[PDB]
Amino acid sequence: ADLEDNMETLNDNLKVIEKADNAAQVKDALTKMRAAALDAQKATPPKLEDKSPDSPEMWDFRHGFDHLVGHIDDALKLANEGKVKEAQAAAEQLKCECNACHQKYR
Numbered sequence: 001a002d003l004e005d006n007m008e009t010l011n012d013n014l015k016v017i018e019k020a021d022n023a024a025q026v027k028d029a030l031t032k033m034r035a036a037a038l039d040a041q042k043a044t045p046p047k048l049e050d051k052s053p054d055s056p057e058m059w060d061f062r063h064g065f066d067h068l069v070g071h072i073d074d075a076l077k078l079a080n081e082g083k084v085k086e087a088q089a090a091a092e093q094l095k096c097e098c099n100a101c102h103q104k105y106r
């Protein structure tokens with residue numbers, strides 16, 4: 001999918017998590033978020049469309065998704081072990097990282 005769709009999916013699955021009732025629901029939502037984040041990593045953001053694929057901006061962009069996924073991964077662990085409330089908190093606080101990349105490249 002293209003970058004905007006993947007970003008909508010992250011934003012929407014965050015909403016799924018915020019109102020989820022059990023760890024299985026949070027697990028599936030974080031799973032779809034992880035895939036979308038790595039899919040978004042393969043795109044080129046409009047602001048960087050005419051930079052080299054190997055530019056420092058493009059690698060800071062791509063590395064942001066690695067960093068996001070690392071936090072999703074530990075949130076996923078919590079949900080895998082039944083910690084609904086902690087995984088929800090871990091998930092909602094991803095917004096800090098969302099906003100940090102947005103300030104630079106959105």
Ligand code: HEC
Nearest residue numbers: 003004007010011045061064065068094097098101105106
């Ligand atoms: C950089 C590594 C990013 C991270 C991490 C997140 N986002 Fe993002 N976002 C990024 C860019 C470069 C853009 C612009 C996309 C474009 O094509 O113009 C966006 C945009 C969004 C949007 C708007 C989507 C749209 O319809 O135009 C949303 C709703 C959004 N981003 C949400 C979002 C969330 C919830 C994130 C954390 C889970 C997140 N983003 C991370 C770059 C990056």
Ligand SMILES: [Fe+3]
Nearest residue numbers: 070071073074
């Ligand atoms: Fe970790």
